[PDB]
Assembly symmetry: D2
Homo-oligomer: 375 residues x 4
Amino acid sequence: DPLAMNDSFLAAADALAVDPMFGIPANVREVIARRGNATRLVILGTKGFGAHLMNVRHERPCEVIAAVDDFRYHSGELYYGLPIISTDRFTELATHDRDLVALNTCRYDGPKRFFDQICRTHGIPHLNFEQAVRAFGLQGNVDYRVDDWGADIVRNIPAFQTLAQRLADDYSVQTLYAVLNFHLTCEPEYYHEVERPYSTLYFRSGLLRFSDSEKMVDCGASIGESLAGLIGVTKGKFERVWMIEPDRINLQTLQNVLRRYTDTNFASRITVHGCGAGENTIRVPFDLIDVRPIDDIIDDAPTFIKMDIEGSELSALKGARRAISEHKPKLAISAYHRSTDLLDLTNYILSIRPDYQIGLRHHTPDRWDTCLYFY
Amino acid sequence: DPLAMNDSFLAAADALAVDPMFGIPANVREVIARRGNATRLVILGTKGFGAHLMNVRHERPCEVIAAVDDFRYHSGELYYGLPIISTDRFTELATHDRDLVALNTCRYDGPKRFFDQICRTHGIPHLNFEQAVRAFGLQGNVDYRVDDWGADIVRNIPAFQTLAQRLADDYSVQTLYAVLNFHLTCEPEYYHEVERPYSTLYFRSGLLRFSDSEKMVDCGASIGESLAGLIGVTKGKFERVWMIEPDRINLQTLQNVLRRYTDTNFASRITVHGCGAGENTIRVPFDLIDVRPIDDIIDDAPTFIKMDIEGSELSALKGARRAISEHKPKLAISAYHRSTDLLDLTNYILSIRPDYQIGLRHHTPDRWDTCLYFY
Amino acid sequence: DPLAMNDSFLAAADALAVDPMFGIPANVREVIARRGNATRLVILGTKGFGAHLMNVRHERPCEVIAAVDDFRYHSGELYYGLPIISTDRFTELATHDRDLVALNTCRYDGPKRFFDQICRTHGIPHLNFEQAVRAFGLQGNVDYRVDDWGADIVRNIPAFQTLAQRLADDYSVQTLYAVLNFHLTCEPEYYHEVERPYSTLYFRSGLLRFSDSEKMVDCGASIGESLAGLIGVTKGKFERVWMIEPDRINLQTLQNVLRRYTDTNFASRITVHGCGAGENTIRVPFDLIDVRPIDDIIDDAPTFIKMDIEGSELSALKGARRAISEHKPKLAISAYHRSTDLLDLTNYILSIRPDYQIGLRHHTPDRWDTCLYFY
Amino acid sequence: DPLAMNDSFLAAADALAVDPMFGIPANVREVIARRGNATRLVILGTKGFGAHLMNVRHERPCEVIAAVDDFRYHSGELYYGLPIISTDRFTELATHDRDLVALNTCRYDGPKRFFDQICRTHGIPHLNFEQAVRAFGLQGNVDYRVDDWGADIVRNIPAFQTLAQRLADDYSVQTLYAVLNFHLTCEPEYYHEVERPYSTLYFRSGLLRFSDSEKMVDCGASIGESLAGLIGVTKGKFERVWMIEPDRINLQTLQNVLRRYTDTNFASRITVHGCGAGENTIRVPFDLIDVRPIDDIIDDAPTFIKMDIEGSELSALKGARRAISEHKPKLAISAYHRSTDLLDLTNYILSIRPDYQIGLRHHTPDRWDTCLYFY
Ligand SMILES: [Cl-]
Ligand SMILES: [Cl-]
Ligand SMILES: [Cl-]
Ligand SMILES: [Cl-]
């Protein structure tokens, strides 16, 4: 019921608080309860999050026996030391082992739905990656970006309810609750109910107005897509772009991006700053990079700050406090890097510029690119 | 300003009412005014809507001289009789002809933005397909699906304002106004502000709740994607699916789709009906097809009616009036086939079941799959 | 022993004369002897010659139960009404059926060697397509181009020995015997011992010298590859090209080919003649085509005649007798269309121009493009 | 005239001896004579041997201004620091610069013939890579594998004539002369007249007979293709395979290759030896590798030695002298690594086993895989 995600949010948080296996399929729970780390597991797919389970820090909590891939099972190649088998071989092994769980590593509809139905048809206990992380107690032993943020959410319920009340539009509220429900339940369909295309990130959110004289701080410029998006929505008309990116390979790419615009009338308005955005000026290991505050990097009052960085977005925002507090530029702040960012970043921005309106959109079919908008 | 699309809607409708060239770039208008049907045009792209301009009924209203395609300009192949040239050859011709307009046939960001910027850089008058249709007065001489619905919208302003007031949620209202603004202005960025992914059509709209015992009428079943989507969101659990599709090639495909589910426990709950959905029972040219009303095709009360058909959706709904009026199933009704469908279909449904709530989402980056939801 | 293919030729011809199952694997012969047309067969591959067995005229001589394709077995699609299964499913069926033969339809090393080894590993009786045609007595019920020419060769042994003696070089003799051995034995490795690349057909045979003033009759011009090859080996320098092609779709393609050379200094030297080459002038069903003799089509003495046509190459050569007899142009005559062509075409040409030297090369990894050279 | 390559060989060697620019197009020679290292050059293609000219040791002998690639000229990417331009931009620059030479880096028919004709049509002086190496005096400053071996051949004429006389068959003689003519003239069409497919290397040469009990030394086993080829031509029947390969990444791949045969009845007959083949036992930088003689690595008399290694093939053969001299196995020795290998390797083998017959085939459309056969 996507029209009552506030209700499901509270119910999920209460359920998880008293049951750490909340959200784990019953048939898998009973195997794990029966066999513990002798549980036999088969990875479905060789192009998904299965690498995150195999690279896991410390001894695995189950015996991984194979990976299924119908397009590779005759190659003789191993998948993280595992044999690669056909789907037919997997259903055969499953019919004869009780006791054998399948990890569906696929994230996209075609492959995911295929393997999920194969499992259902044969009554094979199965899990997606977030469910695997929770069911096998791998919190802290996987990359933080694919970790279980359930418990963190359960500790901050009132603060999330307070954020919900502060959001300017109903769709942002639905989006907030959908993201928190995904983390509480491990159910990706929550994102799917609210998601917007990747192509609409920052520039087509339904919340911001761009003029023909924008001055954009492109913080975490990567490969230049946000510059391409500003160009597109403004029809090649802006005042200034300051692109900030510390990675040396990305900076090589941006030199290629700058060359595609060399004959435009706006080429001279774009600069690239090979540093990271932070709260002060310091040279640190990234390989050393320079880190500088936004307020020192730029030389004019911005109208828009886009932010998607590997480092602390809270430190980066503090390094832009004069720009934010004095000029109230529109902001598009990526909000999916830490379980705490939706609250922490919002709380920081409002403490320095309390008259902002706030929105939230989710822009991929996966857990990436939940983005806060301030205008 | 996507937060004031109601305002832009009224302003655009007033502007168009008194200027048929409303929405056409000034530099193109001045060429067309100066040269009329001696206007020289270059088609940019060979994989877009350019086929719709070349297949146009009756003499063209401009002299089309070439098509640009950097991946094909050495092949010796013609594009609808036109030479295929490089982008460099095009900019050269443009620098020497006043007077020469470019039709950007590309609909997707990469190719579209590329050609739009090429044109801007060199000051070359350019148009997208909807702008071309309006600027050259091709209304009625192109396929109705790619025609200019501007004037139709201008004739029905109060009825659209009345629809806006009837929609249950703000995002549906924003979506309504965004779609109408696209048609009034020929500006696709209006869709982009509100669009959701194609993958979320019907089953992930943010508005409907599906149970584990759904009985779905899949009207216009095509290649079986809606069956795959119901299976996915319900995790292989439903009571019944009646798939209705009249096209013989699609029916061959559905036999393949049915075979992928032969060993599932729900295979017996799905039937295929090789007919079209209409208001009564009649055999008509499509090649003859049988047309039957939904109320006669099905044998139980449905919980959900998905509808996307080539024929009249109003006739199809009248053929389901007993199901709709007596049982109030959820409905997902594709609303983009006629300029009048948003009003006509809604008005019909409410006259037979007035207690429905109504929503609207747009599910592609193009003009396809604007869908009404009733629940 | 490729250094004694003359010996193997005679031995194979004697073996076949007294055993129609010569060349058929013993384990398959014993199944066919035991079960006849109740023999169960599995087609390996869905992209090979398997369509030739399924389209076979009259009732099949075995019960075809499935086709193996690991990249398609979950699609629900049928292969000529057959279920598509995985290789693992096939080895399972084979382990339990005696009695079950596999037809390896693959012609190229990767896929062919894969399936051949799968069969050997599991002791599964298997056949290639030529072996299938012979083992099931399908001579005359398959396309003539993929038929068993064994018996025809056995009837003409001395004439083939006489051809061998007439060939000017040892490699042509080895090639002759390799082609005849393929047909006598159904063993494609015979072609492999002598084959040259497709890219060397006509222009890079190792036998012909082309000058800078060639006048080429391109008989069966198709899609213009021979024109491209003459251009390449002569570095854009020739006197004349007469391209002869009757198929209307090929003639559309040749207009595209002619456009790629429009600015060259040799464009005016090329003409296209939309007719078939034959012995006289007649309009016949191909859809009607004009058929004309080469001697009437051309307007000058040629230096080279390339020939690869669907119709009778003997009739086509008779329609060029004045050119051949009077001017002794170099000839490249495709020799793989009929079991009789190596003898019939050579005998004809020498009767009108007896001073020619003769060579033979085979230019694909399959049975296509065995070509006679006369110079 | 491929029927007189012995004659062309001697004429080319005499021409080169007295003219180092022999084989260079006259129009390019006159530019180079006029401008020397101020010659402006355009590289055609970004996927060929152009990297060999750009990575050249020491200052370039011309000013390289751009690279042409119609599929990349809008990317903003540079090709070894060079701008990437369209073919139309190149013809424009060429029409206005005298003085501007084009290097056609393409080696395959489609792309090579395209650029060669573009150049001819516009009268643009052009060269292939071997011609570039010779015309700009880059001998010794490019990778030895793509260097000009002309002068080396001119110093060894009688020894090559002596090799020609020792070859057992006419096609080997034609092949020898074709390879030497390529190096003397820089004209790749010489290879094309004699080349056989890559798929026929070692196992389908037209010269060797393989039994069902072969014992193969696979020297330079790489990625396991020769094992796959022996398996194919013998239909999975051999006695032993000793695979010798020193590269650690190749050895990882061979473990994958061994797994594809784990259930065959010949898996136990194959061993992998992670060392290089040389004349004695020594540990040397390749990263250190073990180098051992073949006679010590193997434990039985071989029937076949295939050899294609990065190191000295003469040292490797000396490390197999007992096997070669005592048992006369068939040999397939790659002969294209050094300008001297055809003479040096043959001379060595015959000094230890003088009763061998010798053949030679060339197995790619490029300069790779000229192979000597001894049987
Ligand atoms: Cl299950
Ligand atoms: Cl413009
Ligand atoms: Cl077998
Ligand atoms: Cl030239």
